Design a binder for this molecule. Sequence first.
Ligand code: G2M
Ligand code: CL
Ligand code: CL
Ligand code: CL
Ligand code: MG
Ligand code: NA
Ligand code: NA
Ligand code: NA
Length: 326
Amino acid sequence: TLNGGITDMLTELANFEKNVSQAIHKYNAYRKAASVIAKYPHKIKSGAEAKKLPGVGTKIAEKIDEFLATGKLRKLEKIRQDDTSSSINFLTRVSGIGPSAARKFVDEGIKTLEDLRKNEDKLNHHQRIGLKYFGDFEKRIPREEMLQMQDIVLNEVKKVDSEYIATVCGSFRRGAESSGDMDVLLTHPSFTSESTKQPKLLHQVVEQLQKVHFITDTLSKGETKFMGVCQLPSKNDEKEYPHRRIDIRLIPKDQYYCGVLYFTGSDIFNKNMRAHALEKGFTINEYTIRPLGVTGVAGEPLPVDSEKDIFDYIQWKYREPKDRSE
DNA sequence: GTCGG
DNA sequence: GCTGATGCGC
DNA sequence: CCGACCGCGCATCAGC
Ligand SMILES: CC(C)(P(=O)(O)O)P(=O)(O)OP(=O)(O)OC[C@H]1O[C@@H](n2cnc3c(=O)[nH]c(N)nc32)C[C@@H]1O
Ligand SMILES: [Cl-]
Ligand SMILES: [Cl-]
Ligand SMILES: [Cl-]
Ligand SMILES: [Mg+2]
Ligand code: NA
Ligand code: NA
Ligand code: NA
C-alpha cells in the first residue's frame, strides 16, 4: 500500500486493456508494472524514479507523473464515463463471462445485474453459477476459514483413500491472511506420469465432497481439473458462510514438485519464472522442466526432487512460497 | 506497453 | 463422431 | 526497428 495510488491506477488500466480493448499484452504490461511497483520499498516521487524499475516504460512513466500531480488519470476519468466500457467491465466480473461474451451481451442490451438475472436462458452453465453467487465470489476468505476448509477437504479425502495427498496451494500456501478462493493440489499413487492405474480418481473426491455438502456446484469438471463451488457448514442459528470458489487439480504423483510450484503461484511469479527459464534455455510447465534444444524443441524431462531443484536449473536462488506473491 | 537483440 | 481453433479460466 | 510476450484444462463451436 506504499504506492497503492499508482498500483490501483495501473491495475485499472490493465483491466481495461483486457476486458474492453481485448489487448492481452497491454494487460500484462500494466499488471507487471503494478507488481514491480508494489514491491518497490520507496514511495515513488516521480515517473523518472519509476521508469528505473523493469516493466515501467516511457508511457507508464508519464501516467505516473500525471497521477502524482493531479491525483488521477484523465484517460481513466473518461473510461469510467463511457457506458460501454463500464458495462463491459461490470459483466466481466461474473465468473464465466469474458471480454467477448461481455461485449456481445451489451450488443444485445444485456448490461446490468437485473438484465442477467432475467436472462438466465442466455447463459451457459458456468455463467449461470457465476451469476448465482455473484455477490459471494467477490468476498475474501479469512485464513481462519481457509483452515477449517483445509481440514474438511483433507479429512474427507483421507476417508476416500488414505493414499491421497491434498495440498492447499495458491495464496494460502504463500501465507496470505486471506484468499480469493481455495486451490487444492491432489495426488494419488495410482496416477503417475507413467500411467493411470485407477479411473475416476478426481471424480471420487468430488463426489465425497458433494456427499458431505461441502462442494455445492460445478463450473467445469474433467479427469484432472475440477472447478466449482463450496461452502463451510454453519452451526445452529448461525448465518451460513458465503459460497466459495474451489479449484482442485489432480497431478501425476511423480510430478508433484513441478505441480506444487505451478499451483502455489502467484500467476505473475509463474509468468516471470517461466520466462527467465526460456532465457536460460529451459521450459517449465506444471509437469516438468525441460531443456531447449538448438532448434527450440523441448527435450526430455530433467530429474526433479524438490521445488529448489527447479530453481537451481534456472540459476535462481530459492524463494520460499511467502516470497512468490508478485 | 515494454523489452532485448 | 474426430480434430482444431476460440473463450475462459487457473 | 520489431518480434516476443508462460503454459495448459475444460467447454464450446466450426468444419468434416
Ligand atoms: C491470489 C489468488 C488469485 P486468490 O487468493 O485470490 O485465489 P491465487 O490463489 O494466487 O491464484 P489463483 O487462485 O487464481 O490460481 C491458483 C494458482 O494457479 C497459478 N496460476 C494462475 N493463473 C496462472 C497463469 O496464468 N499461469 C500460470 N502458469 N499459473 C497460473 C498460480 C496461482 O497462484
Ligand atoms: Cl495487446
Ligand atoms: Cl516434479
Ligand atoms: Cl511435459
Ligand atoms: Mg486461489
Ligand atoms: Na524501466
Ligand atoms: Na468473468
Ligand atoms: Na483458484
